[PDB]
């Protein structure tokens, strides 16, 4: 293969990204995915497996893979780590008892091999609730300061009203564009 075709393939692959959405069940992953696209929220059902979506944002082709956060599904998350440019970890603020379980889950996702070089965007969903933990609370309970091998950044949101959702994707794209992309 010549240099022209190699450059063409590199440019074609550069215009494609992968944003794997993970998190515990009943967190609001499907709701966020539907609000970011503009679909209806009153007709959403829990994923019995995993859903896929494709869209275009700022010229970049974003492919989102929303996996179920059920107990019997976590063991299969490894089947979605190949070619992952971003990891959207959703955390429910109202969920305060299972937090410890949500901290162990995000901590093990960071010691993986395929997910070594990939941005991290943590969405504190359900922020408009009375007993919704603040951003600092979720940052300290999950121990985000200890993270050093990945570029993380916490940011609350609320899919019920579509707030603080565009800034997260904008920051993810800015961080992805800050590093060099080389084929393999």
């Amino acid at each position: 293969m010549g240099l022209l075709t190699i450059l063409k393939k590199m440019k074609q692959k550069e215009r494609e990204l992968r944003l794997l959405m993970l998190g515990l069940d009943n967190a609001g992953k499907t709701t966020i995915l539907k609000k970011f696209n503009g679909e209806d929220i009153d007709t959403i059902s829990p994923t019995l497996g995993f859903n896929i979506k494709t869209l275009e944002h700022r010229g970049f082709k974003l492919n989102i893979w929303d996996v179920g956060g059920q107990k019997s599904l976590r063991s299969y998350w490894r089947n979605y780590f190949e070619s992952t440019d971003g990891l959207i970890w959703v955390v429910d603020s109202a969920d305060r008892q299972r937090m410890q379980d949500c901290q162990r889950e995000l901590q093990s996702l960071l010691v993986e091999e395929r997910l070594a070089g990939a941005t991290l965007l943590i969405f504190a969903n359900k922020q408009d609730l009375p007993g919704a933990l603040s951003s600092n609370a979720i940052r300290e309970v999950l121990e985000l300061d200890s993270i050093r091998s990945h570029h993380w950044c916490i940011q609350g949101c609320s899919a019920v009203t579509g707030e603080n959702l565009l800034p997260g994707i904008d920051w993810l794209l800015d961080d992805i564009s800050s590093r060099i992309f080389t084929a393999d």
């Binding site: 059920q70 089947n79 190949e82 060099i180």
Partner: protein, 299 residues
């Protein structure tokens, strides 16, 4: 071009497959027109992304109908393969159905296929790919099977065993469907439950096929090529700590196949490819510390 202009024509042609399937007088002209209209976007397949979702829905509703004859379902499989080769299987099969309920029906179709039917090979190929899409579900095959001892005496075969047998039977065909099987090898043998019950068996069979195959007969060469492709897919889409315990045994069989002295250029490429995947299994992936400070993603 800039956008898709032949929208109504393509829609009418796709809605005409139900009246041009019996006689081939109006079946060949439709295929020729579809190919001529699709070849114009061979260099710009990205311009079809916003049309390849509704065309796949129309093509799937025809093959999913139980009252759709063999000749009608095979016509819908040729158009699907055409769209795949035009746009791309990696970007086309990703949008295909991937629910759980689509695990048993699709498989059943793969069971009612004649490998000695060259007039409908496009049906055997694309179908396999669709199966590989239904192995990205986060559940086990034992849960879908349920109770297998429902009939007296003759027990029911699980879905895992059926998929394994189908893959073992199609990695040794001459047609384009062997390649599809390699896709299923990277989607089936890499699963959590399938690997636990179909990794030692699949790796003992591959070693045996590599040990008793010659590069001087037509069949043996096909079997060796299929086995090498399956091993490469396993080592690529597989884990390093599940595949590392086997990389020394595989390396040995590969070296024993004395490929660097064969006059088969494709066997040598597969051997080299399998030699670099096995090698990368002996070392942990590292990350370029030199990024975020020497250039952006684009220019």
């Amino acid at each position: 071009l800039e956008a898709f202009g032949e929208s109504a024509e393509t829609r009418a042609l796709l809605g005409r497959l139900r009246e041009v399937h019996g006689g081939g007088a109006e079946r060949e002209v439709a295929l020729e027109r579809f190919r001529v209209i699709m070849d114009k976007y061979q260099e710009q397949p990205h311009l079809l992304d916003p049309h390849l979702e509704w065309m796949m829905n129309l093509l799937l509703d025809i093959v999913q109908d139980q009252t759709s004859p063999a000749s009608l379902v095979h016509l819908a499989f040729k158009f699907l393969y055409i769209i795949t080769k035009v746009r791309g299987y990696k970007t086309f099969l990703r949008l295909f159905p991937h629910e759980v309920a689509d695990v048993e029906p699709v498989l059943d179709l793969v069971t009612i296929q004649n490998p000695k039917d060259h007039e409908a090979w496009e049906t055997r190929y694309m179908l396999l790919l669709w199966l590989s899409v239904t192995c990205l579900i986060p559940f086990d095959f034992s849960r879908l099977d349920g109770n297998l001892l429902t009939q007296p005496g003759q027990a029911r075969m699980s879905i895992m065993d059926r998929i394994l047998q189908i893959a073992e039977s199609y990695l040794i065909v001459s047609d384009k469907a062997r390649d599809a099987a390699a896709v299923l090898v990277s989607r089936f043998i890499t699963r959590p439950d399938v690997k636990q019950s179909k990794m030692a068996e699949f790796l003992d069979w591959s070693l045996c096929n590599l040990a008793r195959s010659s590069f001087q007969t037509m069949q043996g060469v096909i079997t060796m090529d299929g086995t090498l492709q399956a091993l490469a897919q396993i080592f690529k889409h597989g884990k390093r700590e599940d595949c590392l315990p086997y990389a020394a045994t595989v390396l040995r069989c590969l070296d024993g196949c004395r490929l660097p002295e064969s006059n088969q250029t494709l066997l040598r490429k597969l051997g080299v490819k399998l030699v670099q995947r096995l090698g990368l299994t002996f070392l942990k992936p590292k990350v370029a510390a030199w990024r975020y400070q020497r250039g952006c993603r684009s220019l």
